[PDB]
Amino acid sequence: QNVVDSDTISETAARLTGIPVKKLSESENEKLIHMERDLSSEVVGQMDAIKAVSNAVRLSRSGLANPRQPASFLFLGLSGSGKTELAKKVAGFLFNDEDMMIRVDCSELSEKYAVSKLLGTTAGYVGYDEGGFLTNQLQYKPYS
């Protein structure tokens, strides 16, 4: 036997670090197709959004998407239209669990605290435990 660039290393790294796109999965039906269907099954209307996400996500497959840019969306629209429900359903698909989404409490922001609660502070300041919402999660969840 041997170490295969793809089937062994790409997959090994993914098992170690996460990153589903490097698992070079055998099916974009049971990963992308079902995504559109199931997101559509639960989120009615906003089909346009579902496809926008699914396609942005599609581009990350095999690492095709830009190495320096997260899939990124801005959801505008009528409240009650699923602006955050879709996001949960996306996590619901991605991690097979809606609760794996990292919610960032942007509702509470002031330029004097707004960054610090996400990224924490430097030495010499009361409490280090940096990273409340972003650093502490992203360090452990590369494709959250």
Place this chain on the structure above:
Amino acid sequence: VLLFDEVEKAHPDVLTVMLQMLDDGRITSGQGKTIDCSNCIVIMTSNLGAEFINSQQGSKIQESTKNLVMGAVRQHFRPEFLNRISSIVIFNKLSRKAIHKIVDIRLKEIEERFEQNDKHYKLNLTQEAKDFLAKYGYSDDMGARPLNRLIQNEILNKLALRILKNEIKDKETVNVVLEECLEVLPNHE
């Protein structure tokens, strides 16, 4: 149970924060810890509808008045806030009949505040005082509140003096004045 007294005065910025609290309970601490308070009850209060409750359109608030109040609410809070409210409730105007029932209750509370048995009413005048108080407190402009003032000003202030003057040991009585006053039981004893 959380209670936010006079939410209309809260700056919209904090209400923005309340949006998390009010949906999924994901209110988080300053340090990034999630509280998870979905098991709680949240009650907020305001006076935004006062301009329409003051329309005096019935006891049970009538239609139109309720809608104008909703208008005031919509013109005050952002829709996203209002959308996270399980129920928006408009209180009723406290009618004379309500006032009579209220008087019964408030008088009972006075007895419940009586830590010692030298502060005790038999009261009497359960129709006369009840009627007096009910008429005098029947003012839309203050809801049930002036009753607290009526009781204090017509009954308790006088009681305080009677106590200071040792004109009462226990089991007090209110008498009708053409106004109200108290019975002298012992007299400077």
